[PDB]
Amino acid sequence: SASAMLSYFKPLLDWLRTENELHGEKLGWPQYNWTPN
Amino acid sequence: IYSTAKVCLPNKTATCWSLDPDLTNILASSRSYAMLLFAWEGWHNAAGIPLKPLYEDFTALSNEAYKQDGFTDTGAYWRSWYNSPTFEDDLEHLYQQLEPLYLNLHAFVRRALHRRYGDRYINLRGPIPAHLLGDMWAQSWENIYDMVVPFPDKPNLDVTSTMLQQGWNATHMFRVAEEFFTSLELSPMPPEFWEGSMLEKPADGREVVCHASAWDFYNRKDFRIKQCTRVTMDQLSTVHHEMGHIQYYLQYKDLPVSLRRGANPGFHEAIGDVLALSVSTPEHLHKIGLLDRVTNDTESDINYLLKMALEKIAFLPFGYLVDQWRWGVFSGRTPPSRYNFDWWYLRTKYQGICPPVTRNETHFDAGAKFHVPNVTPYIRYFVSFVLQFQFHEALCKEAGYEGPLHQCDIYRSTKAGAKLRKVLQAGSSRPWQEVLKDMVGLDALDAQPLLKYFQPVTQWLQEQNQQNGEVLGWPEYQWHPPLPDNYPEGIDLVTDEAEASKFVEEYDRTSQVVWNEYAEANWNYNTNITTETSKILLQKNMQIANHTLKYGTQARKFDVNQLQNTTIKRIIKKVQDLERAALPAQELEEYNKILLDMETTYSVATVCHPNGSCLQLEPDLTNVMATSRKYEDLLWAWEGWRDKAGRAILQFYPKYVELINQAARLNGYVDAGDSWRSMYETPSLEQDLERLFQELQPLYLNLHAYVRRALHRHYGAQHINLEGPIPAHLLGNMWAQTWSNIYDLVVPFPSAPSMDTTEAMLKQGWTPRRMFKEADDFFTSLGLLPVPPEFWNKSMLEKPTDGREVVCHASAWDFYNGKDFRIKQCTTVNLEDLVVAHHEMGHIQYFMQYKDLPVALREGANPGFHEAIGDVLALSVSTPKHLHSLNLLSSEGGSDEHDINFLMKMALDKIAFIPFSYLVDQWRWRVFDGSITKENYNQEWWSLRLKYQGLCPPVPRTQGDFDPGAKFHIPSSVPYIRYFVSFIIQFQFHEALCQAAGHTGPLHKCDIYQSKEAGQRLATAMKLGFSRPWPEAMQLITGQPNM
Amino acid sequence: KYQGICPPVTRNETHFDAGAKFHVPNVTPYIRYFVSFVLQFQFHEALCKE
Ligand SMILES: *[C@@H]1O[C@H](CO)[C@@H](O[C@@H]2O[C@H](CO)[C@@H](O)[C@H](O)[C@H]2NC(C)=O)[C@H](O)[C@H]1NC(C)=O
Ligand SMILES: *[C@@H]1O[C@H](CO)[C@@H](O[C@@H]2O[C@H](CO)[C@@H](O)[C@H](O)[C@H]2NC(C)=O)[C@H](O)[C@H]1NC(C)=O
Ligand SMILES: *[C@@H]1O[C@H](CO)[C@@H](O[C@@H]2O[C@H](CO)[C@@H](O)[C@H](O)[C@H]2NC(C)=O)[C@H](O)[C@H]1NC(C)=O
Ligand SMILES: *[C@@H]1O[C@H](CO)[C@@H](O[C@@H]2O[C@H](CO)[C@@H](O)[C@H](O)[C@H]2NC(C)=O)[C@H](O)[C@H]1NC(C)=O
Ligand SMILES: *[C@@H]1O[C@H](CO)[C@@H](O)[C@H](O)[C@H]1NC(C)=O
Ligand SMILES: *[C@@H]1O[C@H](CO)[C@@H](O)[C@H](O)[C@H]1NC(C)=O
Secondary structure, eight states: OOHHHHHHTHHHHHHHHHHHHHHTOOSSOTTOSOOOO | OTTTOOBOOSSOTTSOBOIIIIIHHHHHHOOOHHHHHHHHHHHHHHHHGGGHHHHHHHHHHHHHHHHHHTOSOHHHHHHTTTTOTTHHHHHHHHHHHHHHHHHHHHHHHHHHHHHHHOTTTOOSSSOEEGGGSSSSSSOOOGGGHHHHOSSTTSOOOOOTTHHHHTTOTTHHHHHHHHHHHHTTTOOOOOTHHHHHSOSOOSSSSOOOOOSSOOBOOTTSSOOBOOOOOOSSHHHHHHHHHHHHHHHHHHHTTTSOTTSOSOSSTTHHHHHHHHHHHHHSSHHHHHHHTSOSOOOOOHHHHHHHHHHHHHHHTTTHHHHHHHHHHHHHHHHTSSOTTSHHHHHHHHIIIIIOEEOSSOOOTTOOSGGGSTTTTTTOOOHHHHHHHHHHHHHHHHHHHHHTOOSOGGGOOOTTOHHHHHHHHHHHTTTTSSOHHHHHHHHHSOSSOOSHHHHHHTHHHHHHHHHHHHHHTOOSSOOOTTOOOOOOTTGGGOOSOBOOHHHHHHHHHHHHHHHHHHHHHHHHHHHHHHHSOSHHHHHHHHHHHHHHHHHHHHHHHHHTTBOTTTOOOSHHHHHHHHHHSOTTTTSOHHHHHHHHHHHHHHHHHHHSOEEEOTTSOEEEIIIIIHHHHHSOOOHHHHHHHHHHHHHHHHHHHHTTHHHHHHHHHHHHHHTTSSTTTHHHHTTTTOTTHHHHHHHHHHHHHHHHHHHHHHHHHHHHHHHOTTTOOSSSOEETTSSSSSSOTTTTSSOTTTOSOOOSOOOOHHHHHHHTTOOHHHHHHHHHHHHHHHTOOOOOTHHHHHSOOSOOOSSSOOOSSOOOOOOSSSSOOOOOOOOSSOHHHHHHHHHHHHHHHHHHHTTTSOSTTTTOSSHHHHHHHHHHHHHHHTSHHHHHTTTOOOOGGGSHHHHHHHHHHHHHTTSSSHHHHHHHHHHHHHHHTTSSOGGGHHHHHHHHHHHTSOEEOSSOOOTTOOGGGGSSHHHHTOOOHHHHHHHHHHHHHHHHHHHHTTOOSSGGGOOOSSOHHHHHHHHHHHSSGGGSOHHHHHHHHTSOOOO | OOSOOOOSSOOOTTOOGGGGSTTTTTTOOOHHHHHHHHHHHHHHHHHHHO
């Protein structure tokens, strides 16, 4: 079960979600065909 | 407990079946193995389990009572009625005499049941399962006579019309019986019989079943047979039988009351049955007057004798079996722990019957019979059935009748009735052995008259068994039929063959007309795109969906596994799934709406120039891709089209995937990729395709390297490097499926001899009608039949007459009526136009070749078989020789340079298309089963594009661009692996036909023309259509079953 | 019925499993052993009583 692992990090997941929503960051990498050089 | 027992279904336990009203009807009329077995097991459990302890207690009590009476047993008391010290030995000898007839009958009936039920529930060297026969106790086999009638063409004897023709009613039957009796010096019948008895009760109470009853009020003037007389042949026979009982009563009613009831239990039934059988003879019936004309044949005689055999010979083992078990139980030789063991030993030994389910000592299968609980001896019926034929033979010998015994009669044979009266008047005064010796001259019971009566049927049965090579008896006495799959819950499934044939006939009849109307409506909408035509097409689509739902739901009640056939089994299997019609009404409406929306937003999409001009795909965007050699123009067209079409389709695609997956799951498949791969009926299709592609890889790699070198020569080094992929737009298609078919950049060596197929068509007067005619002429010359003449003047192949010409690309159309083979494609005039024309004529000829097939099989052996058959001839035509024969000039193989040039041109097509075809369809399979998620649709598409093909996106792509949605087949939701398979096997077909053409040489330039043998070989395998699995037709065409 | 044993493999009328016993082909009666087994204990009990 991965549920215990998710419960361990739940405060962090909540804070990360709040921070990402505030910063307006799109989850994932919807520019997959991108390389730095 | 016996009366009140009932069997109830696993669900809906509200009301449930009883024995006499319900269980008898199902166990006599039904032919479903699961239903018959459910009824048999349910009744036997229900009536037997709660009857064992009572029977043990009753056995002990009865034995003790009769031991106090003097007999050692209850069975000893029962046997004491016949007063024969060796009764059991006599019965065993009788059965050993009757064994050959029963063995022949048993083998014949087992063969018929094996034909009907298949060699899994019934084997030909072994017992017959108990439920499969007519009765619940396998007692009599009349209800099985439907499948066992010998030469059923001759109608069975009956005078069912003649009683309505002339007034007979009920009173006259007893009058003719009485006068027949008086025609034998038998004593007349007293007047108290006439009005004091009962014949029909209008309103005086609710009568008893009144099947048979003769009454013997012990006052010497009272005699009644309450019968509820009807007007039927068997009713007349039973009238004679009951009147024979009454005549017995009256003639022997002189001795004291103790010396009554006949010589032994079994004389009464025998005495009645002698007259009952002698009255049903056609000669006596004609002499009475109920049979106007006397036709004659041995076939009706065999039919009658076999019905009699099924009635009586099938019972005789059972009658002896029932009392043998009861004697064993009473004597103590069977403790209350070998009840079922000894019962089933006897059942297998004497009757040759096998239990359908595994039994053991908790069961009491003997208690299911009526006579075991309601304690009544049973050997009287065995004895009576033997004595009846003994008496009949003796009477006919005295009557002077010479000939077959079953046709004898004693009417107007008063001389033969004297000894009948002499035996009859004895009553119970003398032992029955002496009475029998008086009547026949024999002391004990014999089976010789019984075997003499059944001589014709037994001779016919022996001949039929010897011809069929059957083994008499049942070796493999241990064999037991296997339990049906999902037996407790799959009982209400129709597995009858006649019902399946009726369903397939009705489905063909209604589907033919509805699909013909759909074909007309599709043609009209195709050539006349408008509002009214679109509305009528939509209403016909709704009608066809409703019809398909109805008939598929009807066919889902059948059990395709238990049907014993190939054609109807295939039809029911095919129609059992619902083409998206399994979805609920709301879901089906949403699915149709989303499919229409995707098709629409792909069809009307256009990419607009910055200056304002807008370009559609089919007219000019394809052309600006094929004809332009500028990197920026090609990139603009490619990117614009992919962007517009894909971003339009991406909004709808995930919902469509979910809905199609749901429908294909409701149809019994898995995730709608299995549904699409199941058209090929190969469980290992994916591995075969991968192996074929791996075989094809080196040639494609060499061609890709050469084309990349040429494109680097033209476009320079900035746009193409010699190590790495080529951009997807520098090839000649919007999808690079048939790349560099525009091959002026990659031509191997531009020699002076070079035909111009595109220019030759314009230079010559090759109208579309005349080139289509030339294709038809070549097709006919190959050895295949021509198209009906109205095809030319009925189909359209030039131009439209509406605002939109056609959809981007479509195929040929068949109307399923055996008369219309329309064609639709029109693309001005070109070489590609010629090859597409030949492909579509191949399609039409495939459509027409299986016109004689049923509609459900009117589909083609494989989805790729259609294209392969259409395109093998097109491949043959494109050769330099056959193009030379038809308005062109080509040196063919004389100049190896021109041959290599032609091979390269033919390779830039049909290669680089194989990777693309497998690529797009493989991507779709991985999307349908959840391997590819909505997040990385484009990522996985371009990974497959780089892996199988060698292409890279000319411009960076992102998630949110739905590049796979730019193909037509992705939003239209049509499978694509058919094109890969067809391109693989069309060369197999070309090789096979060239081999049959009589020469091989350079296969790449061999052509089929006036090769009637190859055309016949193709026709003999194209005509099976879908009636047989694909490998059979592939082997017929080629010999090698697989790709 | 008496011994309470089953064939490990399925048999049919082709087989003749009664002939595998020595006494069946070599025709010798066999109930003398049953009778003797029953009788010897009767003799023993009577002798012990006497
Ligand atoms: C049944 O019908 C028969 C005739 O089919 C009736 O009996 C005859 O009735 C007719 C009337 O015209 C008389 O002439 C005959 O003499 C009668 N007897 C015979 C033997 O034909 C009879 O009454 C009817 N029975 C019932 C119970 O309704
Ligand atoms: C129909 O034909 C059969 C023969 O197929 C007749 O049977 C004959 O019966 C007479 C006495 O009635 C015997 O003497 C003959 O020897 C029989 N023939 C054979 C071949 O066995 C029968 O009588 C005919 N009529 C009817 C009404 O069945
Ligand atoms: C069982 O299948 C066979 C063929 O495998 C059927 O035989 C033909 O079936 C077609 C299609 O229904 C009929 O038009 C023909 O009349 C059949 N021919 C014969 C000689 O019967 C057969 O009908 C199928 N069985 C049933 C009960 O439908
Ligand atoms: C009796 O059973 C035996 C043993 O199962 C049968 O012999 C087998 O028969 C099958 C069917 O033909 C063959 O495939 C096997 O190879 C046979 N085995 C041997 C060892 O011979 C036998 O046929 C059965 N006999 C009868 C009369 O039913
Ligand atoms: C096509 O539809 C139009 C509707 O205006 C009608 O006039 C025309 O006859 C139709 N053509 C055919 C071939 O049915
Ligand atoms: C299809 O049949 C059902 C049967 O209940 C009917 O209610 C429905 O209206 C039919 N559909 C159409 C489009 O007529």
